Amino acid sequence: FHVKSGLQIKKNAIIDDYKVTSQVLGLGINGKVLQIFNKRTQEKFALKMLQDCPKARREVELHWRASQCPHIVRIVDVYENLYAGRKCLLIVMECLDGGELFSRIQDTEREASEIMKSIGEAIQYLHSINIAHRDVKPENLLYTSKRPNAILKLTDFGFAKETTDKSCDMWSLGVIMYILLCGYPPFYMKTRIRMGQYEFPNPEWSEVSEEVKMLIRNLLKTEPTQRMTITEFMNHPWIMQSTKVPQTPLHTSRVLKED
Numbered sequence: 612f613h614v615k616s617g618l619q620i621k622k623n624a625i626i627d628d629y630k631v632t633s634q635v636l637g638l639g640i641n642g643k644v645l646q647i648f649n650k651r652t653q654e655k656f657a658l659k660m661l662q663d664c665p666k667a668r669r670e671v672e673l674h675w676r677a678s679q680c681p682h683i684v685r686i687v688d689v690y691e692n693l694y695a696g697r698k699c700l701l702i703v704m705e706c707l708d709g710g711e712l713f714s715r716i717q718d719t720e721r722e723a724s725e726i727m728k729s730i731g732e733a734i735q736y737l738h739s740i741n742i743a744h745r746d747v748k749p750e751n752l753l754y755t756s757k758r759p760n761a762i763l764k765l766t767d768f769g770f771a772k773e774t775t776d777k778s779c780d781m782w783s784l785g786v787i788m789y790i791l792l793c794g795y796p797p798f799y800m801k802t803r804i805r806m807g808q809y810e811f812p813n814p815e816w817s818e819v820s821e822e823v824k825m826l827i828r829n830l831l832k833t834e835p836t837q838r839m840t841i842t843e844f845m846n847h848p849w850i851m852q853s854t855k856v857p858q859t860p861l862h863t864s865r866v867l868k869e870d
């Protein structure tokens with residue numbers, strides 16, 4: 612009987628339990644994401660502040676429900692406090708030092724696969740509990756530590772929605788796969804997207820498998836109704852047998868330096 616705990620919205624001042632700094636870890640609709648410190652443990656965390664409305668109350672829900680998945684930024688506590696006489700919801704999540712996915716890169720196929728593979732699990736988890744993330748841009752994929760065995764983790768649930776939408780998550784997955792392999796988006800716009808107008812031009816892509824190209828093409832189908840389901844993405848070999856992919860090298864770092 613493996614029951615994880617429910618969600619507890621603490622009412623004590625958050626300042627009773629953490630020291631809040633002004634280092635800013637991220638920007639978003641609701642203002643800044645602040646680095647804060649657990650007093651008892653002197654460990655570091657990210658703080659997100661929402662105005663308490665029912666939208667806020669819906670993020671926190673989904674995220675919290677989503678949190679017990681290893682590839683999704685984990686919520687550690689949630690408070691309701693007053694701020695300038697306004698109810699707010701404070702989310703305290705795990706702090707992810709490694710910074711944004713791509714930035715790390717700018718410093719191998721197979722390495723690419725592993726990433727896609729982990730991002731897959733994030734979606735797979737979400738989809739199986741009926742949550743569509745929507746906003747799976749690469750800004751929202753952060754690493755736990757600069758240490759190069761760090762884990763890639765998805766964040767930012769400002770646009771999460773219940774599905775009791777998913778096909779558009781797989782789009783992002785395809786765009787992110789794209790940019791991982793060549794170094795730029797498939798779109799160099801509003802009109803080229805609706806059409807499904809994009810190349811695998813060379814010598815950037817000349818070395819890349821038709822196995823891989825197919826897959827991307829299936830993720831970037833203009834028509835949602837048969838873009839690939841996450842369940843199939845994860846079953847597809849490139850991702851499925853992750854480590855037996857050829858360690859064939861790619862220019863992605865160079866290009867994202869150049870660009």
Ligand SMILES: O=C1NCCc2[nH]c(-c3ccnc(-c4cnc5ccccc5c4)c3)cc21
Pocket residue numbers: 636637638639640644657659684704705706707708709710711753766767768769
């Ligand atoms: O929900 C969000 N929306 C807006 C952007 C954002 N960043 C975060 C976030 C969450 C956890 N950690 C970070 C983070 C931690 N450490 C960093 C070090 C250096 C650069 C960026 C960092 C980001 C950011 C959450 C959100």
